[PDB]
Amino acid sequence: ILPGAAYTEKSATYVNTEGRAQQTKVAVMPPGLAREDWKIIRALSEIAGMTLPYDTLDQVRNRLEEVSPNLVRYDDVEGANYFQQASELSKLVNQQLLADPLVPPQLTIKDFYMTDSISRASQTMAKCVKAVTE
Amino acid sequence: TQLITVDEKLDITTLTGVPEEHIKTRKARIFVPARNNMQSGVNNTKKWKMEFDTRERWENPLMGWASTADPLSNLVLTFSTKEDAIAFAEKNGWSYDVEERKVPKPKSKSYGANFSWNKRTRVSTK
Amino acid sequence: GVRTSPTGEKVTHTGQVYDDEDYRRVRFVGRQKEVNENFAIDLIAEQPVSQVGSRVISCDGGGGALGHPRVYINLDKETKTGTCGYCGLQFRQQH
Amino acid sequence: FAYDGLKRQRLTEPMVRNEKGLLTHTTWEDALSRVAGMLQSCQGNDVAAIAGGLVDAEALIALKDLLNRVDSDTLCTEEVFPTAGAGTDLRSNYLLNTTIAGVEEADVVLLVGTNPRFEAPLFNARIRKSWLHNDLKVALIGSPVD
Amino acid sequence: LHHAVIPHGKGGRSSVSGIVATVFGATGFLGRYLVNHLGRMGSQVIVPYRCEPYDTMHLRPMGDLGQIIFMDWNGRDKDSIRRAVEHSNVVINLVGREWETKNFDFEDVFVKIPQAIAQVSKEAGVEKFIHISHLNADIKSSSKYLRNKAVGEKEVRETFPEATIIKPADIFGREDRFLNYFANIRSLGKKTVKQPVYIVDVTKGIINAIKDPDARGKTFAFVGPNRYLLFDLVQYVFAVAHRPWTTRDKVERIHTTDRTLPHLPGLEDLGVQATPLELKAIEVLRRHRTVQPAKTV
Amino acid sequence: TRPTVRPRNDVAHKQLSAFGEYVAEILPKYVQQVQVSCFSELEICIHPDGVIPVLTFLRDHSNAQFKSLADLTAVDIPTRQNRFEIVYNLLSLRFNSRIRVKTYTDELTPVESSVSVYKAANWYEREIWDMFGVFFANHPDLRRILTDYGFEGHPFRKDFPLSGYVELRYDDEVKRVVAEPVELAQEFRKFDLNSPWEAFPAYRQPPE
Amino acid sequence: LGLREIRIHLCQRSPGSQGVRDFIEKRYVELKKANPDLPILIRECSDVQPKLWARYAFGQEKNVSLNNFSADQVTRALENVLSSKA
Amino acid sequence: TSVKPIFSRDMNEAKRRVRELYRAWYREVPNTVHLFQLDISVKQGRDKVREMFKKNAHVTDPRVVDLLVIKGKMELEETINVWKQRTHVMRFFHETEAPRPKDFLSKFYVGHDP
Ligand SMILES: NC(=O)C1=CN([C@@H]2O[C@H](COP(=O)(O)OP(=O)(O)OC[C@H]3O[C@@H](n4cnc5c(N)ncnc54)[C@H](OP(=O)(O)O)[C@@H]3O)[C@@H](O)[C@H]2O)C=CC1
Numbered sequence A: 001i002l003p004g005a006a007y008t009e010k011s012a013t014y015v016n017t018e019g020r021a022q023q024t025k026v027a028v029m030p031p032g033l034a035r036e037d038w039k040i041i042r043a044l045s046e047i048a049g050m051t052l053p054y055d056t057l058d059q060v061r062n063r064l065e066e067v068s069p070n071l072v073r074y075d076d077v078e079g080a081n082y083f084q085q086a087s088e089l090s091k092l093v094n095q096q097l098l099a100d101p102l103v104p105p106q107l108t109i110k111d112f113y114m115t116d117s118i119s120r121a122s123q124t125m126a127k128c129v130k131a132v133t134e
Numbered sequence B: 001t002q003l004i005t006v007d008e009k010l011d012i013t014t015l016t017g018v019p020e021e022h023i024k025t026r027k028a029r030i031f032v033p034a035r036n037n038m039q040s041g042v043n044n045t046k047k048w049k050m051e052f053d054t055r056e057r058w059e060n061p062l063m064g065w066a067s068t069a070d071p072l073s074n075l076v077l078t079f080s081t082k083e084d085a086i087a088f089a090e091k092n093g094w095s096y097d098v099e100e101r102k103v104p105k106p107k108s109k110s111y112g113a114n115f116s117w118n119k120r121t122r123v124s125t126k
Numbered sequence C: 001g002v003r004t005s006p007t008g009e010k011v012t013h014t015g016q017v018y019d020d021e022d023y024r025r026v027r028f029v030g031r032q033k034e035v036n037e038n039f040a041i042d043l044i045a046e047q048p049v050s051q052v053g054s055r056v057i058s059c060d061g062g063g064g065a066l067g068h069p070r071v072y073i074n075l076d077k078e079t080k081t082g083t084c085g086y087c088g089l090q091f092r093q094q095h
Numbered sequence D: 001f002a003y004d005g006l007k008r009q010r011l012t013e014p015m016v017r018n019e020k021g022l023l024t025h026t027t028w029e030d031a032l033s034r035v036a037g038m039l040q041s042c043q044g045n046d047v048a049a050i051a052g053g054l055v056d057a058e059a060l061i062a063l064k065d066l067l068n069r070v071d072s073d074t075l076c077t078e079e080v081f082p083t084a085g086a087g088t089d090l091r092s093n094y095l096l097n098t099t100i101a102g103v104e105e106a107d108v109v110l111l112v113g114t115n116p117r118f119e120a121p122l123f124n125a126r127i128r129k130s131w132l133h134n135d136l137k138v139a140l141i142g143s144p145v146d
Numbered sequence E: 001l002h003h004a005v006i007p008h009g010k011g012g013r014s015s016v017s018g019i020v021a022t023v024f025g026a027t028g029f030l031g032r033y034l035v036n037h038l039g040r041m042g043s044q045v046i047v048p049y050r051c052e053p054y055d056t057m058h059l060r061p062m063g064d065l066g067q068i069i070f071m072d073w074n075g076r077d078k079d080s081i082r083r084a085v086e087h088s089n090v091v092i093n094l095v096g097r098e099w100e101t102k103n104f105d106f107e108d109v110f111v112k113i114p115q116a117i118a119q120v121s122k123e124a125g126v127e128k129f130i131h132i133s134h135l136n137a138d139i140k141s142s143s144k145y146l147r148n149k150a151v152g153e154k155e156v157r158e159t160f161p162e163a164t165i166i167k168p169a170d171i172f173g174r175e176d177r178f179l180n181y182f183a184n185i186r187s188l189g190k191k192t193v194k195q196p197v198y199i200v201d202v203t204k205g206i207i208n209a210i211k212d213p214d215a216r217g218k219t220f221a222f223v224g225p226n227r228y229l230l231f232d233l234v235q236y237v238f239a240v241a242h243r244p245w246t247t248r249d250k251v252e253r254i255h256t257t258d259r260t261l262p263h264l265p266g267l268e269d270l271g272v273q274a275t276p277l278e279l280k281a282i283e284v285l286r287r288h289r290t291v292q293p294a295k296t297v
Numbered sequence F: 001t002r003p004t005v006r007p008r009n010d011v012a013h014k015q016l017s018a019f020g021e022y023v024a025e026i027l028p029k030y031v032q033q034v035q036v037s038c039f040s041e042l043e044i045c046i047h048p049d050g051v052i053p054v055l056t057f058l059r060d061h062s063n064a065q066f067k068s069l070a071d072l073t074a075v076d077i078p079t080r081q082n083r084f085e086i087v088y089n090l091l092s093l094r095f096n097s098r099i100r101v102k103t104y105t106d107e108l109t110p111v112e113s114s115v116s117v118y119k120a121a122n123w124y125e126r127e128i129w130d131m132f133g134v135f136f137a138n139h140p141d142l143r144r145i146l147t148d149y150g151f152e153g154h155p156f157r158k159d160f161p162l163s164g165y166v167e168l169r170y171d172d173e174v175k176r177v178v179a180e181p182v183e184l185a186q187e188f189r190k191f192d193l194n195s196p197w198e199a200f201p202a203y204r205q206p207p208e
Numbered sequence G: 001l002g003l004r005e006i007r008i009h010l011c012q013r014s015p016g017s018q019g020v021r022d023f024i025e026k027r028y029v030e031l032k033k034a035n036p037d038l039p040i041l042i043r044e045c046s047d048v049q050p051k052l053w054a055r056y057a058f059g060q061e062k063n064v065s066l067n068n069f070s071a072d073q074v075t076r077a078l079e080n081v082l083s084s085k086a
Numbered sequence H: 001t002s003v004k005p006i007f008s009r010d011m012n013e014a015k016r017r018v019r020e021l022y023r024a025w026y027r028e029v030p031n032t033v034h035l036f037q038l039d040i041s042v043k044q045g046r047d048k049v050r051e052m053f054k055k056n057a058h059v060t061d062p063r064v065v066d067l068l069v070i071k072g073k074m075e076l077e078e079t080i081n082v083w084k085q086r087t088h089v090m091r092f093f094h095e096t097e098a099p100r101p102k103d104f105l106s107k108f109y110v111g112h113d114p
């Protein structure tokens, strides 16, 4: 187990459903011996003899710009074109629709409060679930 | 003549007495502070602020107090414009990131829309 | 209403006690852990509920200006008593 | 209100399996050495990676570059997106391409296979604001959720 | 690993080093600089003291508030030893006397008290135990000091099998009894070869032995970088000090050559560069002032 | 508005406005602004090349005679490109009056020392060197006056932190007081005290 | 050992990306049909210069500037990338 | 871009003043080691002087190096006149400060600082 940082514990790039890259800021530091996540992976790469070419967060973001440059343009929605080409590629394989009806996994407010590991560890979300199940 | 021409970039880092660890490893954040959503007042969103990245706060073994080793942990600077803050950060060798001012966009308010004939914007109570 | 951990250390009214494997118990070695044994949560539970004939009661904590700011407590719930948010004295409408 | 889960059940120290098969606390040197000794013995499809729901892009490209040094492209997510056709090559076929704000510009919204009230509650709030103020027509293909 | 003993901070005075140390014999020469170097990291240091509390006053500025806990102890009282060690994760033994007293001989100070501290620390669950022997400790030694210190090393090794035993040769510093002994003797010159080690090197070696998990069960020999004959060493001391209490056991130990033990690890295996005498003899012997260096072998 | 409100002194306001006009038209080479506050204090905001000609005027002119240098002050305002605001407070005992002379500099432009006008300035601008880093040219003995001898930085700059960068303790190994990077057992707790509601509409700045 | 992914960065509006846009509007579909299991990541951004990243085996990445190219020049550079596999 | 100088019109006069300040510190180091009865050598103090001069070697602004020469002359005046004590002279030698972790991996081990 490699203890990592949570989203309040690291300056960290997350991209929402519309493509807007955004960064968190460090509010508190990680508890105990837990570390920032890419710091852990970079330390592992140095132990393994395959050391990655970044040392600071800015150098990770330079690599992140090299892989796709919209991940470091924060509070910017980059428009994505080429729906016609993706549509032409989607007409190649004729996948069959199943007869099962479209059922979302969250039907009521009961299924809302616990989705990830932070919400499942929350006593407040547990009181919300217990309050809506009664 | 009594004036010289210095075309160099303005850099005072060797004069400020700041140790090097708190120049080249700090990230200044230049931003208009967000409105406290507990309150409708907007007078705290008028000026630009420069803060730094929060460093480690740990528990004092004797009292449980929040101990820090960051000298810049309470340093918040106030600027009238974004460009003054950028010039002050570049002058001091601080690597910075700038968030743009987020103004609330103008809303279309009509009290008569509470009582429309055929629109969904009727209030069910008042 | 003080109690004792299995280490022998007294638990404060907050609920603070060091763990058995916590090194910080060494500060009490040869010395004492100062606790107050008059727990305010137990002493305000000893006060009887004041039966009043009004719908709204006022509490200032006694002593007038020596108490707390004067607040007004509604007593419409018959299931629950009306508790002062400052001093913890509780009230019940007698009807 | 989920921030109080952020101070429970927390991983605070590196853990490794002992001789009994139980997770015991250890240092960063020992844990990273025991991971890196296994990473050096892998190549190709011998090592893979699953990204969770809360992972930032820095750790994502960190572990991607690390597994690419081992010549592994098997870096997966838990949430399935179909790779048929264009896949994830074009960004447009996996984005909310209109915008969250573009809901205020729409006049007909077709929701397919989603419960946006709980999957993306403020996207649903933007749909309700467009419903209320712009007389938006919303249709749903799926179970009749509220 | 408990949450209160996780290291935090930048290693300064208000930081948490995660070291909870009980230093027996902290009121002496080595304990002074050991509590200094522990307290500047932000370690919890337990000082059991036998002496007047006045004589512990100099240990009080060495750490942050609550980071040095003073408590009474007796060498023949296992209850006080258990009272001092039961919260610590490292116990260092620095108990020593150059002379035997009416109440404590060399067997009490070097055999009985170290075995008592090591046994009580073993049965209290202390992780790390550091014991300080002497480099010239031998069963067949001519001095009672080195004989009892070899016996005590053997008993510490057999009752705490993971103890780090350290062999300093002859420690010099401002409060030593090696250069200050030679500067105030105003005994002779023989064929004795010595390599004296500096006190901050010994302290850095002890604290690196705390932090190294590979130092458990080892026996280290802390020696200086330069071996000197006794005669030109004493002449170098009288040359630096600008010059033209003892017992026969101390005379037997001054005329005992510092043995060479290449099979034991030293200061370099703990990451400590051994400081030569010529850089630090002026710092010691400046007090004795009212220079060509010594020849090495 | 009688009991709780400070009474306004219109006579002194009119007199200080007339004397500010007087100074501004005698010395137009250096005077940039002249203002009188609502509590009747006169400020002459000048160009820094006129430190010596303005202050020698106010010291020596028969209608000014500001013989006393009450105080000499810098103010750090980091949003200005000339961040330091050098403030002279002068007292005329003849006309029973006070005047404020304000000028500006950045970190690198020297201000001319006014020791040849007021010898009182000798320590004050020396303090401005120690606290703010403003160099004063042609000063007799310009050096630090208040900080410790090896002190790095200028403490009354607003980007200098409240606790410094180093702290002292006695170290018994080196037998010496030593300087180390500052660690606080309790961090200074920053209070965000400003109300988000406007307090004074008379001081409202015009928007963008 | 071989090519692992291709990354094509381009602008939506700049003229220097224009031929690169002319590569994707016309020649990307049969490229993807020719290489079905090769990830060819098209990444549009606001003001970037056009660029062709070729990641090879064991993390090796080559870098080709596609600035001010025509669609034929982008096609030739990309088929040099596909035929090299170094 | 037309600024008022402090002492130097350009960088050559500035380097002249830097060079004279270095000469004065180089002459002063043996007297400083003697009268403060320091435990360092003259070579070690001159290496510290060379380190403090090379720390500022990247500056290209004449006003900034004029202020650096002014502050170095102030430090030298505080050293020649016995205004500093032994502690202030030895603060240039960070002897009680433990060596900071330099590489990535040891900084990763000890904490969160980049
Ligand atoms: N040259 C050297 O210094 C060398 C020393 N060593 C060993 O290192 C250790 C520490 O050396 P050092 O600091 O110089 O010695 P000191 O004589 O200066 O200090 C020894 C410490 O042990 C305590 N002590 C002594 N006798 C007793 C006793 N009977 N009961 C309880 N406490 C006692 C003393 O306390 P109090 O003040 O109350 O008497 C003091 O704190 C010793 O074991 C010594 O043999 C090894 C090699 C070289």
Ligand SMILES: [Zn+2]
Binding pocket: C059, C060, C061, C068, C084, C085, C086, C087, C088, C089
């Ligand atoms: Zn009350």
